[PDB]
Amino acid sequence: SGFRKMAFPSGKVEGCMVQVTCGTTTLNGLWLDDVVYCPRHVICTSEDMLNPNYEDLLIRKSNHNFLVQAGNVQLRVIGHSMQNCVLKLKVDTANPKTPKYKFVRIQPGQTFSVLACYNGSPSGVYQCAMRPNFTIKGSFLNGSAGSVGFNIDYDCVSFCYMHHMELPTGVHAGTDLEGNFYGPFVDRQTAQAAGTDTTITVNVLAWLYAAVINGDRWFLNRFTTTLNDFNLVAMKYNYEPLTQDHVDILGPLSAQTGIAVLDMCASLKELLQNGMNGRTILGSALLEDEFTPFDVVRQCSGVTF
């Protein structure tokens, strides 16, 4: 019945999006309860970009110097504070659109939906995944700093990301809602770059299982292999090595389809060692590593929120 990349409905999250302007820089922030969260480098100026020191900028900042906008409505600020690398300003106006929310930190390989917004107005929503080098291959333009990626579980919203900068290589770096950076990055213009990227294995295995579910079975083989062999193959073809947790997590899909994991390992090894022979899987001629097993289960079972 098809298999398409879909993101969570960005209905509750967009209601808490606000705009903040300080001096000459303008971007967007999140408005939960009566505290607004924004990137810390909004107090930084063009001159401060060579070497910024944030404690002096924070102590020298006053309440009136900061302008906060919710669409056309400007609120009032009665206090300010800083937490790690994220500024949280005490705003006297509580947000009636605040949903039930949780703050979580995600490990590499987990997928989340990002609501891209410019100048405090939403523009679009799409899915993305955390690369092993702690980067995301998203689509952001200038002035888009402050967009937040989120996950939805029934009623609770889990926020996991917040855009901060764009690397010279064309990838993006961000921090969690508590101010901790994702990977070895700092908010400065020194020699900042990411490491070597490796394609994930669990995501491509889940994608293959979804393809088998949808009716594509031409790549199935009749062989069985060990686990050290697949670990060596993954490390040899630039893939993250497989573990016992990664072979247990595929239990639901394997039971649903009836095909063992080692057979899929052999099939994937034969696909890598021989290409796709010109055929395409789910309309793609290359392996996709942006489908976690949970996404495959949810889309193929119609779980709704």
Place this chain on the structure above:
Amino acid sequence: SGFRKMAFPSGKVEGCMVQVTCGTTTLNGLWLDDVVYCPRHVICTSEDMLNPNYEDLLIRKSNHNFLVQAGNVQLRVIGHSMQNCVLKLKVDTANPKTPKYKFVRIQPGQTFSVLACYNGSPSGVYQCAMRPNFTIKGSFLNGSAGSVGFNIDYDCVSFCYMHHMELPTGVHAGTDLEGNFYGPFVDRQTAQAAGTDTTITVNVLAWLYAAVINGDRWFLNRFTTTLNDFNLVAMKYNYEPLTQDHVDILGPLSAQTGIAVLDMCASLKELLQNGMNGRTILGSALLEDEFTPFDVVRQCSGVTF
């Protein structure tokens, strides 16, 4: 700065979604003002799937026999009517979430976002395009009939599609909000199938222009060609033939990049006649035909709503 497939924020549309139940069949509908629109085959039963006649069923239908669910809230229905192939039930409760809306009919090649819903609750959003055979390659499971695809223009929402059935071939068919079917399809369980499909040229050209904008210009050539030659090669490789409107519409992108359309036509002909030589463009090894020029302009210029 990246290039991803993103859909419109489903915040205003999500609040207008409601659920209906009649007899044994249950699905979801749209609630605008104080009239609800639902697919017309809800009044059919298991026996009616061989040869249904709707006039008698509407004659015998009463107000109390129809159950409407707005989340947990049940409304009141005062009267019923049908327009073409869509049921319009007069509900005495006006929808406070009704936005500024327009009803439009789209031609093949235009893209829109679909808010998939199950049992009256949203599930996800994704982009899709109207194929020349009047079908869409979406991801819908059983009981998802009634989801509506929409477009957003600043403040006005344009609704263009509504899911009705799943073809045996694995594609979907739907009707506009007025009730006219998209292509030769009837809401009956008989011999129904689509025609031959072809890849749309303008979407591929827009995708190539976006790739050139992002900095991937390894396929650029130094040749010029006529327009009849491109028409011949498009019809030769099963592409929709190009026109003068399709060469004028690419004016903005071509002026922005400074690359003539005929040069891109020659590059595309040489790509099709020789493959991609193992290289990839924007992370895909196959040509993409789901990016209209408007989408390319909007994403590369950061137009927000």
